UniProtKB/Swiss-Prot annotation, chain A:
Tissue: Highly expressed in heart, lung, cerebellum and brain. Detected at lower levels in adrenal gland, stomach, thymus, esophagus and ovary.
Subunit structure: Homotetramer. Can also form heterotetramers with RYR1 and RYR3. Interacts with CALM and S100A1; these interactions regulate channel activity. Identified in a complex composed of RYR2, FKBP1B, PKA catalytic subunit, PRKAR2A, AKAP6, and the protein phosphatases PP2A and PP1. Interacts directly with FKBP1B, PKA, PP1 and PP2A. Interacts with FKBP1A and FKBP1B; these interactions may stabilize the channel in its closed state and prevent Ca(2+) leaks. Interacts with SELENON. Identified in a complex, composed of FSD2, CMYA5 and RYR2.
Protein name per the record: Ryanodine receptor 2
Recorded domain comment: The calcium release channel activity resides in the C-terminal region while the remaining part of the protein resides in the cytoplasm.
Localization annotation: Sarcoplasmic reticulum membrane
Chain's role: Cytosolic calcium-activated calcium channel that mediates the release of Ca(2+) from the sarcoplasmic reticulum into the cytosol and thereby plays a key role in triggering cardiac muscle contraction. Aberrant channel activation can lead to cardiac arrhythmia. In cardiac myocytes, calcium release is triggered by increased Ca(2+) cytosolic levels due to activation of the L-type calcium channel CACNA1C. The calcium channel activity is modulated by formation of heterotetramers with RYR3. Required for cellular calcium ion homeostasis. Required for embryonic heart development.
The record's account of how the chain is modified after translation: Channel activity is modulated by phosphorylation. Phosphorylation is increased in failing heart, leading to calcium leaks and increased cytoplasmic Ca(2+) levels.
Full-sequence range covered: 1566 to 1640 of 4966
Source organism per UniProt: Mus musculus (Mouse)
Origin superkingdom: Eukaryota
Name of the coding gene: Ryr2
Phylogenetic lineage: Eukaryota, Metazoa, Chordata, Craniata, Vertebrata
Family: Belongs to the ryanodine receptor (TC 1.A.3.1) family. RYR2 subfamily.
Knockout consequences: Embryonically lethal. Embryos die at about 10 dpc, due to defects in heart tube development. Cardiac myotubes display enlarged rough endoplasmic reticulum and cytoplasmic vesicles that contain high levels of Ca(2+).
Length: 75, 565
């Protein structure tokens, strides 16, 4: 029945209140990304054969990703 | 056998390409034609392939679509933004009238081109005859201008007029200032004597460009030809052939006399005491700055603009702070520069290939009497088409100019007492959504509270578009999902109803006036309702609900769509 009454815990509240989480966010550019200290280390062909363009990578690599659900974003 | 799935109605704009994504434990083989690969099946009727899509005279190589995705040592070519590379029309000729005082000159140039073209055939020794063919070595245009009809005269003068018109249109007006044959004597004048000026050389070059442009625009209707590719990408042999062939005309004519990216170390490695030194190698010589920035620097402003960064540039040979002052000299392609910071006596120095830089006052140190604050981080900034390599130490065998300068004075590298390499924090390109800060200009958002509102407020001199968005989105899974935009008068607007399990986040893209009070209000009539209440000058502002979409530009159409079948 309401905007704020659909993405919160309760839904039977027909009063239009604004929780402190509802704050406007602008598409900004002041941000920093982190470069991993270990990439996948993939070699493609190193022979460049005539039977196709090869790529091969057997060494695995995993990382732990935090997930913000309210923003639906992984970091 | 094909699949039953297609991505119709998608954004046709953009440079598409084959791309594979693999995690680990994988052995994939792309298959093209020719020497690149080996076809195992047959292509669909008419569909070409990438071994033909590759540009002529170019080696086709596989490489990471994303970035310099090489698990290597510190010797990684860090590059900033890139140019378009022109990876994707003739000049207008007929827009000016034809003066009659040079119509005689134009006819004489037409007969010049005609005699040029028939002596082109006489070099091989063609014969006069009534039948038209190429392999038979015969040409019916051996007859002179008194007997040949006007239609063929017009079709031959087509070329001559086109060329002479483009010759006027380059910006310079053009006014007035044996051997055996069957009866034709082609010899207007001497040609090898006179020397053509480079101005008219470039003129005839741009003219050949124009001619091949119209020829290609006419030939694209008649598939994937090296001649079909524009003249600027043609082979140099045929280039020079056409260039000289069309320069003969002007030789005869003159004869008689008619987004930067900022990289840095991690902010936790801030230093406040001691002698620190780090190298920066620049492969190119474009716009590049290097120095030491405090742990508050902005990743979009130029390095060294505000007091939050102490930088130096080689493109202008000057140090970068609040203000600008000439300092040191510029570098070349493939140079190194070692930056030194002594925190105990608060000195900053730069050594270009061992030679320590010097300003006008004779002071070797760049900056003096700077507070320690909360530290200094090695930082660099690369503009368009730049290639750099940072070295915070940890490899003295590769620290070339470190044992030359600084080692004996008492300077040590940044990360030499270190077991694991630095994180190398860069400036990201995706413009994520950030909450409105309090210490920000031209963006002020209030909070009032009957109904609750979130009013806006701004003050500045430069206008632009913002992409405001709510914090928490609304999801629906897995029932009916329809988004209807209803105005105050009626619901006569665009209604989108396609969402299986998406999280549509409320948003408004607004243009910023001198006074903008447009806001969002959670209202209620029968269901969830948000009213984006605008004010005066509401004609280019949009208000809708969007999933994760992070693109900074200025448009309303082509918002990257798709429909699966």
């Amino acid at each position: 029945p309401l905007s704020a009454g659909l993405f919160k815990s309760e839904h039977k509240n027909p009063v239009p209140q604004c929780p402190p989480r509802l704050h406007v966010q602008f598409l900004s550019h002041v941000l920093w990304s982190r470069m991993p200290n270990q990439f996948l280390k993939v070699d493609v062909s190193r022979i460049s054969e005539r039977q196709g363009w090869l790529v091969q990578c057997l060494d695995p690599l995993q990382f732990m990703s935090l997930h913000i659900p309210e923003e639906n974003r992984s970091v | 056998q094909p699949v039953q799935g297609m991505f119709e109605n998608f954004n046709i704009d953009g440079l598409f390409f084959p791309v594979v994504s693999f995690s680990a434990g994988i052995k994939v083989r792309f298959l093209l034609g020719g020497r690149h690969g080996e076809f195992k099946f047959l292509p669909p009727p008419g569909y070409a392939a990438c071994y033909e899509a590759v540009l002529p005279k170019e080696k086709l190589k596989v490489e990471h679509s994303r970035e310099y995705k090489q698990e290597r040592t510190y010797t990684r070519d860090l590059l900033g933004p890139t140019v378009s590379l022109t990876q994707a029309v003739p000049v207008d000729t007929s827009q000016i009238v034809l003066p009659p005082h040079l119509e005689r000159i134009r006819e004489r140039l037409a007969e010049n081109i005609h005699e040029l073209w028939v002596m082109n055939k006489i070099e091989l020794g063609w014969q006069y005859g009534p039948v038209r063919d190429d392999n038979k070595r015969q040409h019916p245009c051996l007859v002179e201008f008194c007997k040949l009809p006007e239609q063929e005269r017009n079709y031959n003068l087509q070329m001559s007029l086109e060329t002479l018109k483009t010759l006027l249109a380059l910006g310079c007006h053009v006014g007035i200032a044996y051997q055996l044959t069957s009866g034709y004597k082609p010899a207007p004048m001497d040609l090898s004597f006179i020397k053509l000026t480079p101005s008219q050389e470039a003129m005839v070059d741009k003219l050949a460009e124009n001619a091949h442009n119209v020829w290609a625009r006419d030939r694209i209707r008649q598939r994937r030809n090296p001649r079909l590719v524009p003249y600027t990408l043609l082979d140099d042999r045929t280039k020079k052939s056409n260039k000289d062939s069309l320069r003969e005309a002007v030789r005869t004519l003159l004869g008689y006399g008619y987004r930067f990216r900022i990289f840095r170390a991690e902010k936790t490695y801030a230093v406040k005491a001691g002698r620190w030194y780090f190298e920066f190698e620049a492969v190119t010589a474009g716009d590049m700055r290097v120095g030491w920035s405090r742990p508050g620097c902005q990743p979009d402003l130029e390095l060294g603009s505000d007091d939050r960064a102490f930088a130096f540039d080689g493109f202008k040979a000057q140090r970068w702070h609040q203000g600008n002052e000439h300092y040191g000299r510029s570098w070349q392609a493939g140079d190194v520069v070692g930056c030194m910071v002594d925190m105990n006596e608060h000195t900053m120095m730069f050594t270009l290939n061992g030679e320590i830089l010097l300003d006008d006052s004779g002071s070797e140190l760049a900056f003096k009497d700077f507070d320690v604050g909360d530290g200094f981080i090695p930082v660099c900034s690369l503009g368009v088409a730049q290639v750099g390599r940072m070295n915070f130490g940890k490899d003295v065998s590769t620290l070339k100019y470190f044992t030359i300068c600084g080692l004996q004075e008492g300077y040590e590298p940044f990360a030499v007492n270190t077991n694991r390499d630095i994180t190398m924090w860069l400036s990201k390109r995706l413009p994520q959504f950030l909450q409105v800060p309090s210490n920000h200009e031209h963006i002020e958002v209030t909070r009032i509270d009957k109904v609750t509102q979130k009013s806006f407020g701004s003050q500045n001199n430069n206008t632009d578009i913002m992409f405001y968005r709510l914090s928490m989105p609304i999801e629906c899974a897995x029932x009916x999902x329809x988004x209807x935009x209803x105005x105050x008068x009626x619901x006569x607007x665009x209604x989108x109803x396609x969402x299986x399990x998406x999280x549509x986040x409320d948003s408004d893209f607004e243009v910023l006036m001198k006074t903008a009070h447009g806001h969002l209000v959670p209202d209620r009539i029968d269901k969830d309702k948000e009213t984006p209440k605008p004010e005066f000058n509401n004609h280019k502002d949009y208000a809708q609900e969007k999933p994760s979409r992070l693109k900074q530009x200025x448009x309303x159409x082509x918002x990257x769509x798709x429909x699966x079948x």
